Design a protein around this ligand. Structure first.
Ligand SMILES: C[C@H](Nc1nc(-c2c[nH]c3ncc(Cl)cc23)ncc1F)C(=O)NCC(F)(F)F
Length: 285
Protein backbone atom coordinates (compact mmCIF):
# COMPACT_ATOMS: atom_id res chain seq x y z
CA UNK A 1 0.00 0.00 0.00
CA UNK A 2 1.10 3.50 -0.97
CA UNK A 3 1.51 6.60 1.28
CA UNK A 4 0.55 9.95 -0.25
CA UNK A 5 2.94 12.80 0.71
CA UNK A 6 0.09 15.29 0.98
CA UNK A 7 -1.42 13.22 3.87
CA UNK A 8 1.80 13.08 5.96
CA UNK A 9 1.31 15.64 8.74
CA UNK A 10 4.55 16.74 10.43
CA UNK A 11 4.35 16.42 14.21
CA UNK A 12 7.87 16.58 15.70
CA UNK A 13 11.46 16.23 14.61
CA UNK A 14 12.92 13.00 16.12
CA UNK A 15 16.55 13.23 15.17
CA UNK A 16 19.25 13.56 12.58
CA UNK A 17 21.59 10.82 11.30
CA UNK A 18 19.08 12.21 6.68
CA UNK A 19 16.47 13.06 9.34
CA UNK A 20 13.66 11.20 11.04
CA UNK A 21 10.36 12.95 11.87
CA UNK A 22 7.32 11.84 13.79
CA UNK A 23 4.30 12.27 11.37
CA UNK A 24 0.62 11.42 11.43
CA UNK A 25 -0.35 9.61 8.13
CA UNK A 26 -3.81 11.18 8.02
CA UNK A 27 -5.62 10.58 4.61
CA UNK A 28 -9.06 11.07 6.32
CA UNK A 29 -7.81 14.60 7.34
CA UNK A 30 -9.61 14.34 10.80
CA UNK A 31 -6.39 13.69 12.92
CA UNK A 32 -7.38 10.01 13.49
CA UNK A 33 -4.43 8.72 11.33
CA UNK A 34 -1.56 6.48 12.46
CA UNK A 35 1.50 8.15 13.97
CA UNK A 36 4.63 6.90 12.01
CA UNK A 37 8.37 7.67 11.80
CA UNK A 38 9.50 9.10 8.47
CA UNK A 39 13.07 9.16 7.22
CA UNK A 40 14.01 11.64 4.51
CA UNK A 41 17.27 13.03 3.06
CA UNK A 42 18.70 16.49 3.85
CA UNK A 43 21.23 16.37 0.94
CA UNK A 44 19.50 14.24 -1.66
CA UNK A 45 22.57 13.83 -3.97
CA UNK A 46 22.48 10.94 -6.58
CA UNK A 47 25.02 9.00 -4.35
CA UNK A 48 23.00 9.51 -1.08
CA UNK A 49 19.72 8.62 -2.85
CA UNK A 50 21.28 5.36 -4.25
CA UNK A 51 22.54 4.56 -0.70
CA UNK A 52 19.13 5.45 0.86
CA UNK A 53 17.38 3.18 -1.67
CA UNK A 54 19.67 0.34 -0.56
CA UNK A 55 18.79 1.02 3.16
CA UNK A 56 15.08 0.88 2.18
CA UNK A 57 15.59 -2.49 0.44
CA UNK A 58 17.58 -3.80 3.47
CA UNK A 59 14.91 -2.74 5.99
CA UNK A 60 12.01 -4.09 3.82
CA UNK A 61 13.80 -7.49 3.68
CA UNK A 62 13.99 -7.80 7.54
CA UNK A 63 11.02 -9.16 9.56
CA UNK A 64 12.01 -9.73 13.16
CA UNK A 65 10.59 -8.82 16.57
CA UNK A 66 13.82 -6.98 17.37
CA UNK A 67 14.16 -5.01 14.07
CA UNK A 68 12.20 -1.71 13.55
CA UNK A 69 9.26 -2.34 11.12
CA UNK A 70 9.36 -1.07 7.56
CA UNK A 71 5.86 0.29 6.59
CA UNK A 72 6.37 1.74 3.13
CA UNK A 73 7.83 4.35 0.84
CA UNK A 74 6.38 7.68 -0.18
CA UNK A 75 7.31 8.78 -3.67
CA UNK A 76 4.96 11.77 -4.10
CA UNK A 77 11.82 8.99 -7.29
CA UNK A 78 14.51 11.58 -6.52
CA UNK A 79 12.83 12.56 -3.09
CA UNK A 80 11.94 9.21 -1.37
CA UNK A 81 10.61 8.99 2.18
CA UNK A 82 10.96 5.83 4.19
CA UNK A 83 7.91 5.12 6.41
CA UNK A 84 8.48 3.07 9.53
CA UNK A 85 6.64 2.27 12.77
CA UNK A 86 7.01 4.92 15.46
CA UNK A 87 8.47 3.40 18.75
CA UNK A 88 7.18 5.67 21.53
CA UNK A 89 9.76 5.10 24.33
CA UNK A 90 12.60 6.61 22.18
CA UNK A 91 16.16 5.42 21.72
CA UNK A 92 17.57 3.02 24.25
CA UNK A 93 20.41 5.54 24.82
CA UNK A 94 17.76 8.26 25.81
CA UNK A 95 15.57 5.77 27.74
CA UNK A 96 18.52 4.47 29.83
CA UNK A 97 20.09 7.97 30.32
CA UNK A 98 16.63 9.06 31.72
CA UNK A 99 15.83 6.10 34.04
CA UNK A 100 19.48 4.97 34.84
CA UNK A 101 19.80 2.31 37.68
CA UNK A 102 15.91 2.17 37.93
CA UNK A 103 16.35 -0.25 34.91
CA UNK A 104 17.80 -3.28 36.81
CA UNK A 105 20.34 -5.89 35.54
CA UNK A 106 17.55 -8.47 34.70
CA UNK A 107 15.94 -5.73 32.49
CA UNK A 108 19.34 -4.82 30.88
CA UNK A 109 20.00 -8.53 30.07
CA UNK A 110 16.47 -8.88 28.54
CA UNK A 111 17.42 -5.94 26.17
CA UNK A 112 20.89 -7.48 25.60
CA UNK A 113 19.34 -10.86 24.56
CA UNK A 114 16.92 -9.00 22.18
CA UNK A 115 19.77 -6.96 20.59
CA UNK A 116 21.74 -10.30 20.07
CA UNK A 117 18.63 -11.89 18.49
CA UNK A 118 18.05 -9.00 16.06
CA UNK A 119 21.78 -9.07 15.21
CA UNK A 120 21.87 -12.87 14.73
CA UNK A 121 18.87 -12.60 12.35
CA UNK A 122 20.60 -9.74 10.39
CA UNK A 123 23.74 -11.96 10.03
CA UNK A 124 21.63 -14.76 8.45
CA UNK A 125 20.92 -12.26 5.55
CA UNK A 126 24.74 -11.53 5.28
CA UNK A 127 24.14 -7.90 6.37
CA UNK A 128 26.80 -5.97 8.41
CA UNK A 129 25.14 -3.24 10.50
CA UNK A 130 28.44 -1.22 11.01
CA UNK A 131 26.79 1.18 13.56
CA UNK A 132 25.60 -0.93 16.49
CA UNK A 133 25.32 1.55 19.47
CA UNK A 134 22.57 2.31 22.04
CA UNK A 135 21.65 5.43 19.97
CA UNK A 136 20.60 2.98 17.14
CA UNK A 137 18.39 0.78 19.38
CA UNK A 138 14.72 1.82 19.99
CA UNK A 139 12.43 1.04 22.89
CA UNK A 140 8.93 -0.17 21.91
CA UNK A 141 7.83 -0.66 25.53
CA UNK A 142 9.46 -1.79 28.86
CA UNK A 143 9.71 -5.38 27.52
CA UNK A 144 10.92 -4.91 23.91
CA UNK A 145 13.78 -3.17 22.11
CA UNK A 146 14.50 -3.09 18.36
CA UNK A 147 17.54 -2.32 16.22
CA UNK A 148 17.21 0.80 14.04
CA UNK A 149 19.20 2.90 11.60
CA UNK A 150 20.33 0.59 8.78
CA UNK A 151 21.97 3.68 7.13
CA UNK A 152 25.51 2.24 7.27
CA UNK A 153 24.51 -1.42 6.62
CA UNK A 154 26.49 -3.31 3.95
CA UNK A 155 25.73 -6.57 2.21
CA UNK A 156 28.68 -9.02 2.26
CA UNK A 157 30.01 -9.92 -1.26
CA UNK A 158 29.12 -13.52 -2.34
CA UNK A 159 32.73 -14.84 -1.97
CA UNK A 160 33.93 -12.85 1.14
CA UNK A 161 33.21 -12.74 4.91
CA UNK A 162 34.11 -8.99 5.04
CA UNK A 163 33.08 -5.74 3.31
CA UNK A 164 35.95 -3.22 2.68
CA UNK A 165 34.86 0.49 2.80
CA UNK A 166 37.17 2.34 0.31
CA UNK A 167 36.39 6.00 1.15
CA UNK A 168 34.96 6.19 4.71
CA UNK A 169 32.60 8.98 5.74
CA UNK A 170 31.92 9.93 9.40
CA UNK A 171 32.78 6.81 11.44
CA UNK A 172 31.88 5.86 15.07
CA UNK A 173 35.59 5.03 15.73
CA UNK A 174 35.07 4.49 19.48
CA UNK A 175 32.74 1.44 18.62
CA UNK A 176 35.11 0.10 15.84
CA UNK A 177 37.00 -3.16 15.82
CA UNK A 178 40.84 -2.72 15.25
CA UNK A 179 40.62 -4.18 11.70
CA UNK A 180 37.86 -1.65 10.86
CA UNK A 181 40.22 1.15 12.03
CA UNK A 182 43.29 -0.20 10.23
CA UNK A 183 41.89 -1.75 7.01
CA UNK A 184 38.22 -0.44 6.91
CA UNK A 185 37.11 -4.17 7.01
CA UNK A 186 33.62 -4.86 8.34
CA UNK A 187 32.19 -8.23 9.16
CA UNK A 188 29.81 -10.10 11.55
CA UNK A 189 32.91 -10.20 13.87
CA UNK A 190 33.29 -6.37 13.83
CA UNK A 191 29.51 -5.99 14.67
CA UNK A 192 30.24 -8.45 17.60
CA UNK A 193 33.09 -6.08 18.75
CA UNK A 194 30.52 -3.12 18.55
CA UNK A 195 27.99 -5.26 20.50
CA UNK A 196 30.55 -5.53 23.38
CA UNK A 197 30.68 -1.67 23.30
CA UNK A 198 26.82 -1.62 23.44
CA UNK A 199 27.01 -3.96 26.52
CA UNK A 200 29.48 -1.51 28.10
CA UNK A 201 27.10 1.42 27.31
CA UNK A 202 24.22 -0.41 29.04
CA UNK A 203 26.12 -1.31 32.23
CA UNK A 204 27.54 2.29 32.54
CA UNK A 205 23.89 3.58 32.32
CA UNK A 206 25.03 6.12 29.62
CA UNK A 207 27.13 8.09 32.27
CA UNK A 208 28.80 10.83 30.03
CA UNK A 209 32.16 10.76 31.99
CA UNK A 210 32.24 6.96 31.41
CA UNK A 211 31.22 6.99 27.68
CA UNK A 212 33.46 5.03 25.16
CA UNK A 213 34.71 8.42 23.61
CA UNK A 214 35.49 9.86 27.14
CA UNK A 215 37.32 6.70 28.30
CA UNK A 216 39.31 6.06 25.14
CA UNK A 217 40.30 9.81 24.99
CA UNK A 218 41.54 9.58 28.61
CA UNK A 219 43.62 6.45 27.67
CA UNK A 220 45.15 7.98 24.54
CA UNK A 221 45.43 11.47 26.16
CA UNK A 222 42.91 14.38 25.68
CA UNK A 223 45.67 16.27 23.76
CA UNK A 224 45.22 13.92 20.74
CA UNK A 225 43.26 15.48 17.78
CA UNK A 226 41.77 14.54 14.42
CA UNK A 227 43.60 11.67 12.58
CA UNK A 228 46.10 11.33 15.58
CA UNK A 229 43.13 9.98 17.68
CA UNK A 230 42.77 7.06 15.14
CA UNK A 231 46.57 6.46 15.11
CA UNK A 232 46.74 6.33 18.97
CA UNK A 233 43.48 4.34 19.32
CA UNK A 234 44.88 1.62 16.92
CA UNK A 235 48.14 1.35 18.97
CA UNK A 236 46.17 1.30 22.24
CA UNK A 237 43.84 -1.55 21.09
CA UNK A 238 46.90 -3.49 19.66
CA UNK A 239 48.49 -3.32 23.14
CA UNK A 240 45.26 -4.58 24.88
CA UNK A 241 44.11 -1.16 26.10
CA UNK A 242 40.35 -1.61 26.73
CA UNK A 243 37.34 0.08 28.27
CA UNK A 244 37.16 -0.71 32.06
CA UNK A 245 34.71 -2.94 33.90
CA UNK A 246 31.68 -0.59 34.58
CA UNK A 247 31.00 -0.01 38.32
CA UNK A 248 28.78 -2.82 39.68
CA UNK A 249 28.85 -4.85 36.43
CA UNK A 250 28.47 -8.61 37.10
CA UNK A 251 31.79 -10.45 36.36
CA UNK A 252 30.04 -12.81 33.80
CA UNK A 253 28.75 -9.77 31.80
CA UNK A 254 32.18 -8.08 31.85
CA UNK A 255 33.66 -11.46 30.61
CA UNK A 256 31.30 -11.31 27.57
CA UNK A 257 32.46 -7.69 26.74
CA UNK A 258 36.14 -8.70 26.95
CA UNK A 259 35.52 -11.71 24.65
CA UNK A 260 33.75 -9.48 22.07
CA UNK A 261 36.82 -7.17 22.23
CA UNK A 262 39.30 -9.81 21.03
CA UNK A 263 41.98 -8.56 18.57
CA UNK A 264 41.76 -12.00 16.88
CA UNK A 265 38.62 -11.75 14.67
CA UNK A 266 37.99 -15.55 14.70
CA UNK A 267 38.08 -15.78 18.53
CA UNK A 268 35.13 -13.34 18.94
CA UNK A 269 31.86 -15.14 19.98
CA UNK A 270 28.95 -15.58 17.57
CA UNK A 271 25.59 -13.76 18.05
CA UNK A 272 23.96 -17.23 18.23
CA UNK A 273 26.21 -18.15 21.24
CA UNK A 274 25.88 -14.67 22.84
CA UNK A 275 21.98 -15.00 22.85
CA UNK A 276 22.31 -18.52 24.43
CA UNK A 277 24.81 -17.21 27.07
CA UNK A 278 22.79 -14.09 27.99
CA UNK A 279 19.54 -16.16 28.26
CA UNK A 280 21.35 -18.65 30.60
CA UNK A 281 22.60 -15.65 32.79
CA UNK A 282 18.94 -14.32 32.84
CA UNK A 283 17.69 -17.83 33.84
CA UNK A 284 20.33 -18.09 36.66
CA UNK A 285 19.34 -14.58 37.91
C1 LIG B 1 17.74 9.75 13.32
C2 LIG B 1 16.80 9.07 14.31
N1 LIG B 1 16.99 9.67 15.64
C3 LIG B 1 16.12 9.50 16.68
N2 LIG B 1 14.97 8.71 16.53
C4 LIG B 1 14.15 8.60 17.63
C5 LIG B 1 12.96 7.77 17.53
C6 LIG B 1 12.03 7.59 18.54
N3 LIG B 1 11.06 6.67 18.17
C7 LIG B 1 11.36 6.23 16.92
N4 LIG B 1 10.64 5.28 16.23
C8 LIG B 1 11.13 4.98 14.97
C9 LIG B 1 12.31 5.63 14.44
CL1 LIG B 1 12.83 5.13 12.89
C10 LIG B 1 13.05 6.60 15.15
C11 LIG B 1 12.57 6.93 16.46
N5 LIG B 1 14.38 9.23 18.84
C12 LIG B 1 15.50 10.00 18.98
C13 LIG B 1 16.40 10.17 17.93
F1 LIG B 1 17.46 10.90 18.09
C14 LIG B 1 17.12 7.56 14.30
O1 LIG B 1 16.70 6.84 13.37
N6 LIG B 1 17.83 7.02 15.39
C15 LIG B 1 18.19 5.61 15.40
C16 LIG B 1 17.17 4.72 16.04
F2 LIG B 1 15.99 4.76 15.41
F3 LIG B 1 17.55 3.44 16.04
F4 LIG B 1 16.96 5.03 17.31
Amino acid sequence: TQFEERHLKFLQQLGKGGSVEMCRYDPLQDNTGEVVAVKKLQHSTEEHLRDFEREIEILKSLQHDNIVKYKGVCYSRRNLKLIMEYLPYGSLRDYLQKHKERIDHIKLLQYTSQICKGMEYLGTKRYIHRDLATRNILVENENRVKIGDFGLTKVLPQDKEYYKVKEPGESPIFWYAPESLTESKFSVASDVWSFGVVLYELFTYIEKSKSPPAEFMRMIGNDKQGQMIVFHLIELLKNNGRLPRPDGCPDEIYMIMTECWNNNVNQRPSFRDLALRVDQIRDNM
